[PDB]
């Protein structure tokens, strides 16, 4: 549910889209997520590794 469980009622959202809001919140246009989603996911999985 992203940040929304802080504010209230924990609105569900698909994770790929809330990450693209995280990108949009740091001035990187949200298409950068949806285009590079496999790379970003693979980078995250490697970093947890």
């Amino acid at each position: 549910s992203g940040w929304t469980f802080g504010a209230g009622a924990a609105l569900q959202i698909p994770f790929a889209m809330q990450m693209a809001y995280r990108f949009n919140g740091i001035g990187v246009t949200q298409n950068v997520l949806y285009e590079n989603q496999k790379l970003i996911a693979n980078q995250f999985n490697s970093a947890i590794g």
Partner: peptide
């Protein structure tokens, strides 16, 4: 390139002017 994209028409507010 986009995962999970969907198909819909996107309206163009210029089109009815050129049409008219």
């Amino acid at each position: 390139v986009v995962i999970g994209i969907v198909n819909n028409t996107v309206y163009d507010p210029l089109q009815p002017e050129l049409d008219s």
